[PDB]
Structures are given as structure tokens and as C-alpha cells.
Write a protein that binds this ligand. Structure first.
Ligand code: HAS
Ligand code: HEM
Ligand SMILES: CCCCCCCC/C=C\CCCCCCCC(=O)OC[C@H](O)CO
Ligand SMILES: CCCCCCCC/C=C\CCCCCCCC(=O)OC[C@H](O)CO
Ligand SMILES: CCCCCCCC/C=C\CCCCCCCC(=O)OC[C@H](O)CO
Ligand SMILES: CCCCCCCC/C=C\CCCCCCCC(=O)OC[C@H](O)CO
Ligand SMILES: CCCCCCCC/C=C\CCCCCCCC(=O)OC[C@H](O)CO
Ligand SMILES: CCCCCCCC/C=C\CCCCCCCC(=O)OC[C@H](O)CO
Ligand SMILES: CCCCCCCC/C=C\CCCCCCCC(=O)OC[C@H](O)CO
Ligand SMILES: CCCCCCCC/C=C\CCCCCCCC(=O)OC[C@H](O)CO
Ligand SMILES: CCCCCCCC/C=C\CCCCCCCC(=O)OC[C@H](O)CO
Ligand SMILES: CCCCCCCC/C=C\CCCCCCCC(=O)OC[C@H](O)CO
Ligand SMILES: CCCCCCCC/C=C\CCCCCCCC(=O)OC[C@H](O)CO
Ligand SMILES: CCCCCCCC/C=C\CCCCCCCC(=O)OC[C@H](O)CO
Ligand SMILES: CCCCCCCC/C=C\CCCCCCCC(=O)OC[C@H](O)CO
Ligand SMILES: CCCCCCCC/C=C\CCCCCCCC(=O)OC[C@H](O)CO
Ligand SMILES: CCCCCCCC/C=C\CCCCCCCC(=O)OC[C@H](O)CO
Ligand code: CUA
Ligand SMILES: [O-][O-]
Ligand SMILES: [Cu+2]
Lengths: 166, 549, 31
């Protein structure tokens, strides 16, 4: 009874430990898949790319937000975003639909979030470093940026706008 | 009591723990209504006038609930339980040293916390700069564990010395792997505190590199959450079985779980840094894979623990596929709390698993999903487990008895707690799926998230439910504390028996080769963190601190 | 055999799967 129950419990726990292992693996395989696809653009470029948060608004690609959008391919644009306290430049960001958008986002004070609502673009922004993500907007229109990392008292109201052009 | 002075030290670690839970928790129902788009902060400010911002409360809440209370409890359990199993006395000098270190560190850190001087949340990321008293007070508090680590390794070796050629007793095996795992895990934050945080806050250096600090933090960051969970697992494993009316189905299966937590708790921390720049994707993919592995031991636990209960319930006449569930001791809160906690742990880890999968993390990162997920983890399973210990530990420690009525009030707190955590978990997951950011005073921007009107009602409800549960627990805790009957103090801890099947002596012995596994575990940390850290220290780029509150 | 245990892990699996497959759908929807 105790002898029998122990025999079965263990016998069956093993099946489960194999099944759970399999399921875990199939997940891994499905994560790997996405790694191979255009949807993985949103993963930040793990390349270090230091800048100086003190001077960034005076010199460089962040000093003039009216020039933050730069075409880099026949169908690709680079946008230079400053997430700050408490907002984003430029406002709005305007890109055409169907183009690959290389977001190069940095902070001048604290850490903010750059979470583009309705999209997969959700990347921490750290002062001193440029955070690089890639996205291609499919539907034209107005998307909202939300700061999802605590950045001081002005946090709840810290939003931005991306406007995708038909 | 003059013969078991470990009882008094254990007592203090518990009470201070519970105090911290209460004070921290006061802020919870307020954050709940906040995420239900309802602003009750006005009211609270009248009531507790030092509170200057939603965020000041959110610092207190996390610091006091997630850092202070959980650890005290870990310390209270994972020293005393092994001490009683081995029937041996702790180094009382050390045992007190550790308590004072915790109490002193806590008082010091509480001062700037209460003074609106370190409103940075429990993760304290630079370049947000808190008062030096916070980081020192934090450090001294956390270092208190090193003294606990010693005590238990002490006890361990002394026992082995008196008993060579014998396998480490269960609770003691769990406790030892626990602490050893914590040591490795603790280095990250120590390093962050010592190399970076302290000097900065003291003003020795002008700025800190936010990326390196996040990296060092999340070293300690993740395995700290297992350090939180394990003492509850220890109880669920080596006690719950008896309270449920049965036995633990497998000694070795429990050990395997714990061994896995030693090897797999630390090297997985990029999972908190999936949205961080300057960290190679390949390493993220690695850490994600390894994270997925560390789910195994809980998955294993799930079965070992469930089976133990089925057995417990069948012995009590349960017949059928469900019969055993209703056969269990549901009138006993010491039994109920943890079971309920494990229940909410299903959806809990289910979200953990998602969070862990890299690219899927971008769907949920930094949204209310997260808090919704982890409240099932720490604020439920662990908290509940520690709650039901009132009904078996406390009498064990103080002689004082649990009246019949107090028991019933216990069931109430436990149940309403569990229910509140469920309800809130719905609202938050749902709200995070609608993009509502975590860590935001959203009720102050009330026209910002209209699509989130449904889940918001769950939030509010959860708020009031959990206010009632907390209130009840306060009343009840103080009704037990401020109550000594003789046999209740000297009677044994409800350590369960183990079911009789030839075990795996071969594996139990292997697992007992602890020196070996400790090194293995450490090598993994070097392999998994090493490369990235070298590249990150090579290219340090500190930045000015800010105080935006 | 341990029917209850199996039952519990059946609920565990389904939950995990609903949770996981769900977010993955949402990942690809936002992609
Ligand atoms: C107590 C503390 C916590 C534990 C344990 C925990 C476990 C894990 N977590 Fe986590 N964690 C993550 C992944 C996981 C995974 C893979 C696990 C695993 O350990 C999960 C394993 C669990 C299971 C697979 C469940 C097994 C089920 C059991 C054991 C119950 C069985 C029921 C029974 C037997 C009842 C029977 C009863 C009857 C009577 C029928 C990730 C990413 O990969 C994120 C980052 C999210 C982001 O983007 O910020 C994260 C975020 C956090 C945060 C936020 C930190 C912050 O403030 O930024 C907190 C506090 C936290 C706490 C905790 N979480 N986690
Ligand atoms: C009366 C019960 C409590 C309620 C209503 C509650 C509610 C809240 C809410 C709504 C938040 C999210 C606030 C936000 O993201 O802006 C939160 C976060 C938090 N809670 Fe609690 N909770 C309570 C008890 C606990 C306890 C027991 C712990 C763990 C021991 C805890 C752990 C956490 C942590 C770690 C945070 C994250 C803080 C941060 O982001 O800095 N909760 N809770
Ligand atoms: C979820 C399914 C996982 C449950 C695991 C079921 C595996 C079956 C098993 O292990 O069965 C052993 C028995 O001895 C053979 O009749
Ligand atoms: C507990 C039960 C949970 C209940 C489930 C609710 C979650 C539903 C959908 C999330 C998926 C998001 C899909 C985003 C696509 C919408 C979109 O494209 O909107 C932005 C647009 O640019 C504006 O103009
Ligand atoms: C800061 C002062 C530290 C407070 C010192 C108080 C420690 C007292 C204690 O717990 O030690 C008992 C000891 O035997 C002595 O009476
Ligand atoms: C032992 C107890 C306290 C150590 C004394 C520590 C005193 C060091 C205080 C340093 C300080 O206040 O420096 C702040 C500076 O402006 C940078 O932010
Ligand atoms: C607790 C931490 C206190 C002291 C640790 C050692 C601090 C020693 C001071 C080192 C600071 C230093 O050398 O400053 C670097 C400077 O920024 C380059 O110009
Ligand atoms: C445990 C050891 C096993 C680990 C196996 C993971 C190895 C390589 C992941 C591939 C990384 C490629 C992801 C890059 C995504 C991308 O293209 O980013 C833009
Ligand atoms: C939105 C969700 C909010 C609602 C919350 C739902 C979550 C699950 C609740 C309880 C699980 C309890 C299941 C097991 C039942 C325990 C009761 C029992 O078996 O009692 C026996 C009875 O006393 C004869 O002796
Ligand atoms: C459908 C909508 C409903 C909204 C949710 C309302 C929430 C709480 C109401 C009170 C619930 C109190 C539950 C106490 C259960 C209890 O204590 O039962 C012990 C039992 O005998 C086995 O342990
Ligand atoms: C456990 C029971 C919990 C909640 C009851 C269900 C409440 C959900 C109903 C929400 C209705 C609401 O608030 O309105 C929706 C929206 O505004 C329409 O236009
Ligand atoms: C005794 C046990 C009974 C347990 C209750 C059953 C759960 C249902 C509702 C909870 C009521 C809480 C709702 C509080 C007001 C909601 C609110 O804030 O309304 C805004 C509206 O939805 C947007 O316009
Ligand atoms: C213990 C758990 C007990 C669970 C009871 C749930 C709370 C109340 C339910 C009745 C519903 C009444 C809701 C009617 C008022 C809603 C409303 O208008 O909202 C508030 C108002 O805006 C001011 O802030
Ligand atoms: C301290 C870390 C090493 C612990 C394992 C070890 O070496 O233990 C052997 C013990 O001294 C003999 O019983
Ligand atoms: C033990 C506790 C176990 C509870 C957890 C089970 C998991 C999910 C329940 C949520 C229900 C499934 C959600 C359906 C998804 C949905 O509504 O999909 C949106 C779609 O666009 C249509 O509007
Ligand atoms: C405690 C309670 C936990 C609640 C979490 C429950 C389920 C999460 C599953 C994810 C929900 C997925 C729904 C969205 C969906 O299915 O949408 C895809 C569609 O193609 C475009 O929107
Ligand atoms: C017996 C052993 C058999 C075990 C087999 C496991 C089968 C399960 C999953 C395989 C994963 C299929 C991977 C397909 C990925 C494609 C995908 O998900 O595509 C959707 C997306 O919209 C496109 O852009
Ligand atoms: Cu910027 Cu939060
Ligand atoms: O942190 O799990
Ligand atoms: Cu983690």
C-alpha cells in the first residue's frame, strides 16, 4: 500500500517530468523561430554605444529633433529619439508605413521606457547609452508611446506620439 | 526557553517580519484602487501624513513587503527548522548578531525612506539617486544573511562531525543548499553596493553606469526571489504533508528540486534585462533557455507536493478523483494558507514561463501584467505560507495557544487574502495586456487608459477585499501575540514522515556531495555572467545622479 | 496510480499552455 503507492507516484512523476521537459523544449523551439523572423527587430542591438547625456541636447543627432528622421536605405529610416523628463523629442515622430524604422533612443536624465502602444517595441532607455530597435509599421495612423519605467514624479503623464504616414 | 534560546531569536525574526509586512501592506489597497482608476491617496495622506507621493508608498511597499519581511521569514525558517531537525543549538552569539544587523540596517534604511529621501522603488536603479542611508541600511540589512549562512553551515558541519558516513538530513540538506545558493546570488548586489552604489551616494564618485548597475543588480535580483520562495517550499515539503494528514511521498525528489535550485537559481538574470540595450542577444537567448530550466524544480515540486496531498487525502477516506480534496483538513488554516498559495501559483508560474521567453517578454514587460503575475508568487504563495505558520510555529515558539475562534479568524484572513490576490491578478494581467504601465499613478491620469475599464473594476474590488483581509490579519496577529500553556511550547514541530519505498541511495549520496555542487553552481555563474561583465566593465560610462521627486 | 496528482498537473499544463500560446498570438499580432 505504502510500498505500492510510492512505486506508482514515482513511476508517474517521471512521465510528467519528461512531458514538461518536452513542452519546455517546444517553447524553446518556438522562441528560436521568432529569433529568425522580422518580428525579432524589436530585440535591442546588444552593441554598446556610449554617448554623453550632458551634451546630447547640444551636439549630435539629438540636438535638432526636426532632423531626427534620416533615410538610410531605399526603404529604411533612422529616427533619433530623446526620451526625457518628461516626454520625447520629436513630437510627433513621423515615418512612412512599410519602411524599416531603426529607432536610436537615449536619455539625458534618468531611465525611461519606450513602449510603443499596439506594437512589440518595448525597450528600456538608459542615460549614457543608445538603445537600438527595428520595426516596420504596417497600419498607418497614430500610435502612442508610453514610458513604462519609473522616472520620477512626472511618470504617469509621460507620453509620446508616432504618426505613421499612409 | 532557557534551554531553547533559538526559539526567542526565531520569534523576533518572525515578528519584525510580520511588522514589516503590515506597514508595507498598508500601501497595497491604495495601489489596488489606483490601478482601478480610483484616487484614494488624499485619504491616506490625512491618515499617514509623512507620505508625500504615490511613489513614496510604492518604495515603502516593495522594500518592506518584498525585501524586509520575506528575508526575515527566510531567516526565521531556514535557521530554526534545521536546528530542530538536527536537535542542535545554533550559535546564539551569531544568531543574535544577525538579528541586530537586520534590525539596525532596517532602522537606518527606514529613516530616509520615511523622509522622502530615497523614493526610487525597491530596485533603486541609477541614475535616480537615493540618500546614502538607504543603500548602507539596505546593505547592512542584506549582509545579515551572511551571518545566517555561517550559522547553518556551522550547525551542518558539527552534525556531520558527530555523524560521518551519514547523509545530510532532509530539512538540513534543503537549508544548506538554500544558503549556499544565496551566497553566490548575494555577490551581485554586494558588488553593486560596494563598487558603485555606496561610493556614489556618499559622493566619492560623480556618476554611475546605469547598465552595469542593472546587470549587477539582476545578478542578485532573480535568485533573491528563490531565496524568498524556498523557505515556504521547505515548509510545504517537510511539514504540510503532516498537517494534511499524510506523508511526504519522496525524500530524494525533494532534494533533487533543491539541488536544482542551487545550480539553476543565479545564472538566469538577463530575463529581467530583455529590454536592456548593450547586452548581446545570444546571451539573452542563453539566459532564457536556462531560466526555462529553473522552472523544472518547481514543476517537479508541483507533482511531488500534489501527490503528497492526494496521499494525505486518501488516508482520510477520500475516494474518487476529487474525493481526496474534500477529505483534507480545510478547517485548519496552517494547512489551508499554503495549499491556497500553491493554487494561485499555477497561473503564477504560467506567467513566469511566458515572461521567460525572450521575445514574448516585449508583449508584457513593465506593464501591470508583471505585478499581476508576481503577486501570485510572493504576495500570495510565500505570504500565505508564512501566515499559516502563525498557527503552528508561533505556539511552538511561545507556549501561547491558538484559541478556537482565532483559528476561524485565521481561515477568514487566509481565504479572503487568497481571493483578493486572485481578483487583483485578473485585473492586472488583463490591464497589462491592454498596455497599462506598471509603477504608474494611473488614477491621476484618469482619461489615459479607457480600454481598461473592465479589469479596473477587478482592481478596485481586490483593493477593498484585501483591505478587509489585511485589517483582519492585523487584529488577529496582535490577538495572538498579546495573548503561555506548557505542552504547546515543548511539543514537537509537525515534521511529516516519509513514505516507504526504497529510495535512491545512489542519488541521495550523489546529491549529498555538496562541496561539489556548490562549485558547479559557481562555475555556471562565471560562464553565464562572466563574459558580459568583463565587456561591461571594460567600457564603463558613468552618468550624473538625479532626484526627480 | 495517482489520479489527483495527474489531475492537478493536467490543470497546470493547460494553464501554462493557454497562457503561453495566448501571449505568442499577441506577440504576432503586434509584430
Ligand atoms: C516568489 C518570487 C518569485 C518566483 C518564484 C518567481 C518565479 C519565476 N519567475 Fe518571476 N520573473 C520571470 C520568470 C519567472 C519564472 C520562469 C519563474 C519560475 O520559477 C516558475 C516556475 C513555476 C511553475 C512552473 C509552477 C509550478 C506549480 C506549482 C508548484 C503549484 C502546484 C499546485 C499544487 C500542487 C496545489 C495542489 C492543491 C490542491 C488541493 C488541488 C521573468 C522573466 O523571465 C520576469 C521578468 C518580467 C519582466 O519583463 O519584468 C519575472 C519577474 C518577477 C518580478 C518582478 C521584478 C521586478 O520588480 O522587475 C518579481 C518580483 C518576481 C517574483 C517571482 N517570480 N518575478
Ligand atoms: C493587501 C495586499 C496588497 C495589495 C492590495 C497589493 C497591491 C499592489 C499593487 C496594486 C502593486 C502595483 C503598483 C504599481 O505597479 O504601480 C503592488 C506592487 C508590489 N507589491 Fe504589492 N500588494 C499587497 C501586498 C504585497 C505583499 C505581501 C508583497 C510581497 C510580500 C507585495 C509585493 C509587491 C512588490 C515587490 C511590488 C512591486 C513594487 C515596485 O514596482 O517597485 N505585495 N502591490
Ligand atoms: C500531461 C501528461 C503528463 C503525465 C505523464 C504521464 C506519463 C505516463 C507514465 O509515466 O506512466 C507510467 C506507467 O507505469 C505506465 O503505465
Ligand atoms: C484575462 C482575459 C484577457 C482579455 C484579453 C484582452 C487583450 C486583447 C488584445 C491584446 C492584443 C493587442 C493587439 C494590438 C493590435 C491593435 C492595433 O493595431 O492598435 C493600434 C493602432 O495603431 C491604433 O490606431
Ligand atoms: C547600536 C547598538 C547595538 C545594540 C546592542 C544591544 C544588543 C543586546 C543583545 O541582544 O545581546 C544580549 C547581550 O548578552 C548583552 O546583554
Ligand atoms: C557609520 C555610520 C555612518 C557613516 C557616515 C557616513 C556619512 C557620509 C555622508 C556623505 C554625504 O552626506 O554626502 C552626500 C553627497 O552630497 C553626495 O550625494
Ligand atoms: C563602502 C565604499 C567606501 C569606500 C570604498 C573605496 C572607495 C575609494 C575611493 C575611490 C574613488 C576614486 O578613486 O575616484 C575615481 C574618480 O572618479 C576618477 O577620477
Ligand atoms: C544553453 C546554451 C544554448 C544556447 C543556444 C542559443 C544560441 C544562440 C542564439 C541565437 C542568437 C541570435 C538572436 C539574434 C536576434 C536578432 O537577429 O536581433 C536583431
Ligand atoms: C476571478 C477569480 C476569483 C474567484 C476565486 C476563484 C479561485 C479558486 C478559489 C478557490 C480554490 C479552492 C478549490 C478547492 C476547494 C476547497 C474547499 C473544500 O474542498 O472544502 C471541503 C469542505 O469543507 C468539505 O469538508
Ligand atoms: C461571483 C462574484 C463574487 C465576488 C467575490 C466576493 C469576495 C469575497 C466574499 C466573501 C468570501 C469569503 C470566503 C471565506 C471562505 C472560508 O473561510 O471558508 C473556509 C472553508 O470552510 C474551507 O477552508
Ligand atoms: C468576481 C466578480 C467581479 C466583477 C464583476 C464583473 C464586473 C465587470 C463589468 C464592468 C462594467 C463596466 O465597468 O463598464 C464597462 C464599459 O464602461 C462599458 O461601456
Ligand atoms: C459581499 C460580496 C460581494 C462582492 C462584490 C461582487 C463583485 C462585483 C463588484 C464589486 C464592486 C466594486 C466596484 C466599485 C465601483 C467601480 C467603479 O469604480 O466604477 C467605474 C465604472 O466602471 C467606469 O465608468
Ligand atoms: C469584504 C469584501 C466585500 C466586497 C464588497 C464589494 C464592495 C461594494 C460592493 C457594493 C457595490 C456598490 C458600488 C456602488 C458605488 C460605485 C461608484 O459609483 O463608485 C464609487 C464613487 O465613484 C466614489 O468614489
Ligand atoms: C563553505 C562551503 C563548502 C561546503 C561544503 C564542504 O566543503 O563541506 C564539508 C564539511 O566540512 C565536512 O562535513
Ligand atoms: C487555477 C486557475 C486557472 C485559471 C487560469 C486559466 C487561464 C486563462 C483563463 C482566462 C480565460 C481565457 C481568455 C480568453 C482570451 C480572450 O478573451 O481572447 C481575446 C479575443 O480577442 C476575444 O475577444
Ligand atoms: C489570473 C488570471 C490570468 C489572466 C491571463 C489569462 C490568459 C492569458 C492569455 C493571453 C490572452 C490572449 C488574448 C488575445 C488574443 O487571443 O488575440 C490574438 C489576436 O489574433 C489579435 O488580438
Ligand atoms: C511527436 C513529436 C512531434 C513534436 C512536434 C511539436 C509540434 C509543435 C510545434 C512545432 C512548432 C512549429 C513552428 C512553426 C512556427 C510558425 C509560426 O508560429 O508562424 C506564425 C507566424 O504568424 C508566422 O509569421
Ligand atoms: Cu519617463 Cu517613466
Ligand atoms: O524573479 O522571478
Ligand atoms: Cu527573475
Amino acid at each position: 500500500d505504502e510500498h505500492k503507492a510510492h512505486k506508482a507516484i514515482l513511476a508517474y512523476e517521471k512521465g510528467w517530468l519528461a512531458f514538461s521537459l518536452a513542452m519546455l523544449f517546444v517553447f524553446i523551439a518556438l522562441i528560436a523561430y521568432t529569433l529568425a523572423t522580422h518580428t525579432a527587430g524589436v530585440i535591442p542591438a546588444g552593441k554598446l554605444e556610449r554617448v554623453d547625456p550632458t551634451t546630447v541636447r547640444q551636439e549630435g543627432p539629438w540636438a535638432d529633433p526636426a532632423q531626427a528622421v534620416v533615410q538610410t536605405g531605399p526603404n529604411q529610416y533612422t529616427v533619433y529619439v530623446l526620451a526625457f523628463a518628461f516626454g520625447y523629442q520629436p513630437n510627433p515622430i513621423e515615418v512612412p508605413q512599410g519602411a524599416e524604422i531603426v529607432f536610436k533612443i537615449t536619455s539625458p536624465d534618468v531611465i525611461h521606457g519606450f513602449h510603443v502602444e499596439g506594437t512589440n517595441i518595448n525597450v528600456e532607455v538608459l542615460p549614457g547609452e543608445v538603445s537600438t530597435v527595428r520595426y516596420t509599421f504596417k497600419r498607418p495612423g497614430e500610435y502612442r508611446i508610453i514610458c513604462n519605467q519609473y522616472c520620477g514624479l512626472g511618470h504617469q503623464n509621460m507620453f509620446g506620439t508616432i504618426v505613421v504616414k499612409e | 526557553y532557557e534551554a531553547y534560546p533559538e526559539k526567542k531569536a526565531t520569534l523576533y525574526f518572525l515578528v519584525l517580519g510580520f511588522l514589516a509586512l503590515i506597514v508595507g501592506s498598508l500601501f497595497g489597497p491604495f495601489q489596488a484602487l489606483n490601478y482601478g482608476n480610483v484616487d484614494a491617496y488624499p485619504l491616506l495622506k490625512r491618515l499617514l501624513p509623512f507620505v508625500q507621493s504615490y511613489y513614496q508608498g510604492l518604495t515603502l511597499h516593495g522594500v518592506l513587503n518584498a525585501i524586509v519581511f520575506t528575508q526575515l521569514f527566510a531567516q526565521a525558517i531556514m535557521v530554526y527548522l534545521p536546528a530542530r531537525e538536527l536537535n542542535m543549538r545554533p550559535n546564539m552569539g551569531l544568531m543574535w548578531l544577525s538579528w541586530w544587523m537586520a534590525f539596525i540596517g532596517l532602522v537606518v534604511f527606514a529613516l530616509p525612506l520615511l523622509a522622502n529621501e530615497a523614493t526610487v522603488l525597491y530596485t533603486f536603479y541609477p541614475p535616480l539617486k537615493g540618500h546614502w542611508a538607504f543603500y548602507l541600511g539596505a546593505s547592512v540589512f542584506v549582509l545579515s544573511t551572511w551571518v545566517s549562512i555561517y550559522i547553518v553551515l556551522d550547525l551542518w558541519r558539527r552534525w556531520k562531525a558527530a555523524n560521518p558516513g551519514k547523509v545530510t538530513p532532509l530539512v538540513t540538506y534543503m537549508a544548506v543548499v538554500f544558503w549556499l545558493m544565496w551566497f553566490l546570488a548575494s555577490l551581485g548586489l554586494v558588488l553593486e553596493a560596494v563598487l558603485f552604489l555606496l561610493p556614489w551616494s556618499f559622493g566619492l564618485v560623480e556618476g554611475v553606469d546605469p547598465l552595469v548597475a542593472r546587470t549587477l543588480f539582476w545578478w542578485t535580483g532573480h535568485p533573491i526571489m528563490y531565496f524568498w520562495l524556498l523557505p515556504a517550499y521547505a515548509i510545504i515539503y517537510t511539514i504540510l504533508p503532516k498537517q494534511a494528514g499524510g506523508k511526504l511521498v519522496s525524500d530524494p525528489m525533494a532534494r533533487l528540486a533543491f539541488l536544482l535550485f542551487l545550480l539553476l537559481s543565479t545564472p538566469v538574470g538577463f530575463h529581467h534585462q530583455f529590454a536592456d540595450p548593450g547586452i548581446d542577444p545570444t546571451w539573452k537567448m542563453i539566459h532564457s533557455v536556462l531560466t526555462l530550466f529553473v522552472a523544472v524544480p518547481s514543476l517537479m515540486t508541483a507533482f511531488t507536493v500534489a501527490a503528497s496531498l492526494e496521499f494525505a487525502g486518501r488516508l482520510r477516506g477520500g475516494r474518487g478523483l476529487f474525493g481526496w480534496i474534500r477529505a483534507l483538513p480545510w478547517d485548519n488554516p496552517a494547512f489551508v494558507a499554503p495549499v491556497l498559495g500553491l493554487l494561485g501559483f499555477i497561473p503564477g508560474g504560467a506567467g513566469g514561463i511566458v515572461n521567460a521567453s525572450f521575445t514574448l517578454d516585449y508583449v508584457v514587460h513593465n506593464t501591470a501584467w508583471v505585478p499581476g503575475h508576481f503577486h501570485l508568487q510572493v504576495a500570495s504563495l510565500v505570504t500565505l505560507t508564512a501566515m499559516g505558520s502563525l498557527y503552528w510555529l508561533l505556539p511552538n515558539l511561545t507556549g501561547k495557544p491558538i484559541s478556537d475562534a482565532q483559528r476561524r479568524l485565521g481561515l477568514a484572513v487566509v481565504w479572503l487574502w487568497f481571493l483578493g490576490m486572485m481578483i487583483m491578478a485578473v485585473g492586472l494581467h488583463w490591464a497589462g495586456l491592454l498596455n497599462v504601465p506598471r509603477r504608474a499613478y494611473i488614477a491621476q491620469v484618469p482619461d489615459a487608459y479607457p480600454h481598461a475599464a473592465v479589469p479596473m473594476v477587478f482592481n478596485v474590488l481586490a483593493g477593498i477585499v484585501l483591505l478587509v483581509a489585511l485589517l483582519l490579519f492585523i487584529y488577529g496577529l496582535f490577538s495572538v501575540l498579546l495573548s503561555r500553556k506548557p505542552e504547546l511550547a515543548e511539543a514537537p514541530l509537525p515534521f511529516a514522515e516519509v513514505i516507504s519505498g526504497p529510495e535512491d541511495r545512489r542519488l541521495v549520496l550523489a546529491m549529498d556531495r555538496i562541496g561539489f555542487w556548490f562549485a558547479v553552481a559557481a562555475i555556471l555563474v562565471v560562464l553565464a555572467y562572466g563574459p558580459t561583465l568583463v565587456q561591461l566593465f571594460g567600457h564603463l560610462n558613468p552618468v550624473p545622479g538625479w532626484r526627480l521627486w | 496510480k495517482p489520479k489527483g496528482a495527474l489531475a492537478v498537473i493536467l490543470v497546470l499544463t493547460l494553464t501554462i499552455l493557454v497562457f503561453w500560446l495566448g501571449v505568442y498570438a499577441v506577440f504576432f499580432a503586434r509584430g
